[PDB]
């Protein structure tokens, strides 16, 4: 008779405490669901025949509750059994569980790491929803499994097996415009406009001065 | 039993100064039954029926 | 009150509940019974009488 | 009184228990409630109002 | 004080008729006849609103009305002494309020804090350190584990012969005790254990969900406990028998070391390598660098051509400098506007 | 068992007599680290002497990541070599020092709640926030960490004799607990 779940009597009200065991299955199960797809009101008025082009008493005011109101009726209603909203000591914090890596990104990473020092930067738009702490996590992690990779990533300090002209350009295909001076001229449009409303706002103030003078001597 | 608490331990051993019930009245009465158990919030209570 | 002092917050505002706050409040129905009843005077508002 | 999970007659401190310990004989109120915790609203039971 | 003629110091209050003067037993003397009966503002405002917030985590946790009280003064020197400023109001008072319910001993942890306020546990207890060691506390005591099987019995709803599985517990927690387990473990975890064990062999309340929402520690971390403790000593004894009467003490092996051994006259003034041999290794020329030069640092630099290559992706992934720009160039809109 | 205690992390900052731009040694470095809304200097990895280079933009740089003190002398003006190549002037005058981490192992099991009350008017701990206990010595200003598989870290060391003579010192407060 182990101290491991021993069926061994009465055992009343458990109905509740196994259903909400077994519902947090699912849980923990739609996490997965989502990460595998994610790789891939004016006024109103009326033509009364009394008095004709007249306005309304009721739309004058709007409520700013009943548009509140029909986004909740289609919400899920649920019956909370008090075993569900359980908390530990992992509540209410940070992070969450990265990926485990794949072969198909090693030969995205170190050859990443070849060519570049070790330049996070533009290695986290390269894994589109991965963030930057955690490739430093998965670069201080493979400094302890595998110790000689990265001394040979180091060590190689030339243009590689030329095969990444295409991973050279598979980055710059996305949105293909010179960055270089293409972010010039649309803040040189940006400075235009602003150059725009100096003048809207100094012959505004010109206006002001007429107008408050003609009233003094009149 | 009003000064501000102190977090050490110097000097606390003798601090009790005496406040008794005396039992007045002109005649000499018994104790009849004397309980002793706690209220609501744990603070004890004493309840002594002559 | 104690709601929206809580919901006057950007982040404070999706993984808010509101029934962890309940308790803070609930001590006024047991003591405005109980000092009502000791202590016989009533203190209403909406008739305002004594 | 009683709760809609147990819904049980009660375990209560009985009178002649309370008058010895200067506490109030005194049975809870219990709520039913539903309300919009986020993404859907929750229905939760006896919810202790005093 | 002192009588006039015989200079006593003891004097008694003599009510045999309803005198109630002062007179010693020395000469009688009365000393007294006639006895006469009894018949800043915004620091102030600072504390009348953090009056109300010890009296609002106490109604809800009932915390007994004599520990606010008793609270209110490690508020008040950590209020003069330049502690509240800065940091969060309704994450001091708790921190607070902790120190009075452990001097207390009470059965209260310190998560029921901050699952009201639905901040982490160590948010608010980070606080906590720096208030402990900075104002100077320096008796406080233990977390004793066994305070908490007392109170979980109450709110768990178990049967009404609630006695023999607290009796059984606490000698399992004396048994607890002596062996080696928690040590640097935590005091709700071994605790949220044994009474699991304890109402074991008596019940089938063991379903780790209720105790569980009990304890408020994970459900697979108690699991681990009661492997660590099968697995000691005189425990297979008492796996499905043997009545709960051992005396033994047994062997010592607290899991940290036993990962330790998976893994396989004083000192003289003179003996150890000291420091001042390591800064005189570098000639210490303040305005050169020559000396510790070497080949692969030198060709450390960049690709020449390829500046523009990577500052493309670098404007590219951009968006800061633009942000940074127009706020400049809206420092001097404002400026005459 | 005469065992000598490792030191993994020396930290070390260095004053320059030149003010720092982060455009001319950022964009065309190798190293390239610099966020401008995440953090307001740039870092350099590099794995020989396996240091880190750590700067700030008016002027100032800290060195940290090396094993000993020479170790990180010539780590220091390797980075400031880097400062050779763009035309500022990198002049440096005191290679200050004020943290160096040591970790070791006596390993026996000790009892650390019973010391909690024994020498429990000055050092203490918390047991469910942080598994080991922290302790203070004020004989050397020191603060250490021990634990109950018989590690102990040595941090906060201001200067690297210090804790020398304060390790051997702390030695003997274990010695009374055999836990008998
Ligand atoms: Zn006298």
Redesign the pocket.
């Known amino acids: 008779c182990k101290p491991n779940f021993p069926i061994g009597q009465i055992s009343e009200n458990f109905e509740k405490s196994k259903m909400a065991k077994k519902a947090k299955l699912e849980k923990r199960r739609h996490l997965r669901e989502l990460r595998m797809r994610a790789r891939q009101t004016a006024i109103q008025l009326k033509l009364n025949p009394d008095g004709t082009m007249a306005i309304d008493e009721e739309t004058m005011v709007v409520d700013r509750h009943k548009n509140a109101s029909i986004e909740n009726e289609y919400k899920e209603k649920v019956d909370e059994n008090p075993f569900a909203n359980l908390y530990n000591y992992g509540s209410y914090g940070r992070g969450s569980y990265t990926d485990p890596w794949t072969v198909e990104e090693m030969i995205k990473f170190y050859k990443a790491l070849s060519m570049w020092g070790t330049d996070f930067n533009l290695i986290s738009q390269l894994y589109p929803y991965r963030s930057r702490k955690q490739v430093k996590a998965k670069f201080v992690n493979e400094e302890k499994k595998r110790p000689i990779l990265i001394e040979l990533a180091l060590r190689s300090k030339l243009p590689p097996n030329f095969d990444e002209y295409c991973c050279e350009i598979k980055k710059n295909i996305g949105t293909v415009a010179d960055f270089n001076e293409k972010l010039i001229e649309l803040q040189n449009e940006h400075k235009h406009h602003m150059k725009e409303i100096e003048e809207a706002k100094n012959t505004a103030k010109e206006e002001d001065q007429t107008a408050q003078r003609l009233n003094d001597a009149n | 039993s009003a000064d501000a608490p102190n977090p050490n331990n110097v000097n606390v051993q003798t601090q009790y100064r005496e406040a008794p019930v005396i039992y007045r009245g002109p005649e000499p009465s018994h104790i009849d039954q004397v309980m002793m158990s706690v209220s609501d919030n744990d603070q004890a209570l004493i309840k002594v029926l002559l | 009150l104690s709601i929206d002092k809580v919901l006057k917050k950007p982040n404070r505002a999706m993984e808010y509940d509101a029934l962890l706050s309940i308790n803070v409040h609930s001590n006024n129905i047991t003591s405005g019974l109980n000092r009502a009843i000791s202590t016989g005077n009533w203190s209403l508002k909406r008739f305002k009488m004594e | 009184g009683k709760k809609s999970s147990s819904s049980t007659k009660d375990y209560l401190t009985p009178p002649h228990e309370c008058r010895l310990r200067d506490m109030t004989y005194s049975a809870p109120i219990y709520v039913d409630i539903e309300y919009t915790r986020g993404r859907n609203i929750i229905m939760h039971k006896d919810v202790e109002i005093g | 004080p002192?009588?006039?003629?015989?200079?006593?110091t003891e004097?008694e209050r003599d009510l045999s008729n309803a005198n109630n003067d002062l007179?010693?037993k020395?000469?009688?003397?009365v000393?007294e006849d006639n006895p006469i009966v009894s018949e800043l503002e915004s620091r102030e405002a600072t504390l009348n609103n953090a009056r109300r917030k010890l009296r609002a985590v106490s109604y809800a946790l009932h915390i007994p009305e004599y520990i606010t009280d008793a609270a209110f003064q490690w508020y008040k020197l950590a209020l003069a002494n330049n502690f509240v400023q800065g940091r969060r109001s309704q994450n001091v008072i708790a921190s607070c309020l902790y120190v009075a319910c452990r001097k207390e001993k009470t059965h209260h942890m310190l998560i029921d804090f901050s699952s009201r306020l639905q901040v982490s546990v160590y948010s608010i207890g980070a606080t906590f350190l720096k208030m402990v060691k900075k104002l100077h506390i320096t008796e406080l005591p233990l977390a004793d584990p066994s305070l908490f099987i007392q109170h979980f019995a109450e709110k768990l709803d178990l049967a009404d012969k609630k006695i023999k599985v607290v009796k059984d517990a606490v000698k399992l927690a004396q048994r607890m005790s002596k062996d080696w387990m928690f040590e640097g473990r935590r005091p709700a975890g071994i605790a949220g254990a044994c009474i699991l064990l304890a109402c074991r062999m008596n019940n089938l309340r063991r379903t780790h969900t209720e105790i569980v929402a009990v304890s408020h520690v994970a459900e697979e971390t108690l699991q681990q406990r009661l492997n660590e403790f099968k697995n000691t000593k005189a425990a297979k004894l008492s796996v499905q028998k043997f009545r709960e009467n051992d005396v033994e003490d047994g062997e010592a092996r607290p899991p940290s070391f036993v990962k330790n051994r998976k893994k396989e006259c004083p000192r003289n003034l003179h003996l150890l390598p000291t420091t001042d041999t390591y800064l005189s290794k570098v000639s210490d020329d303040p305005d050169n660098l020559e000396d510790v030069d070497d080949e692969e640092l030198n060709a450390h630099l960049l690709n020449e051509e390829a500046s523009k290559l990577k500052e493309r992706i670098w404007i590219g992934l951009n968006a800061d400098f633009l942000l940074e720009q127009e706020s400049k160039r809206l420092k001097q809109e404002a400026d005459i506007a | 068992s005469g065992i000598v205690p490792t030191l993994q992390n020396i930290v070390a900052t260095v004053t320059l007599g030149c003010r720092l731009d982060l455009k001319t040694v950022a964009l065309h470095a190798r190293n390239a680290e610099y966020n401008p809304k995440r953090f307001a200097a740039v870092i350099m990895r590099i794995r020989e002497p396996k240091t880190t280079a750590l700067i700030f933009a008016s002027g100032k740089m800290v060195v940290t990541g090396a094993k000993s003190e020479d170790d990180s002398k010539l780590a220091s003006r390797k980075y400031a070599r880097i400062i050779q190549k763009i035309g500022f002037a990198a002049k440096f005058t005191d290679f200050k020092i004020q943290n160096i981490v040591g970790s070791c192992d006596v390993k026996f099991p000790i009892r650390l709640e019973g010391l909690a009350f024994s020498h429990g008017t000055f050092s203490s701990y918390e047991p469910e926030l942080f598994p080991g206990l922290i302790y203070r010595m004020v004989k050397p200003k020191i603060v250490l960490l021990i634990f109950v598989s018989g590690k102990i870290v040595l941090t906060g060391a201001k200067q690297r004799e210090e804790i020398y003579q304060a390790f051997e010192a702390i030695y003997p407060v274990l010695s009374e607990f055999r836990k008998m």
């Open positions: 002192v009588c006039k003629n015989c200079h006593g004097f007179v010693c020395a000469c009688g003397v000393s």
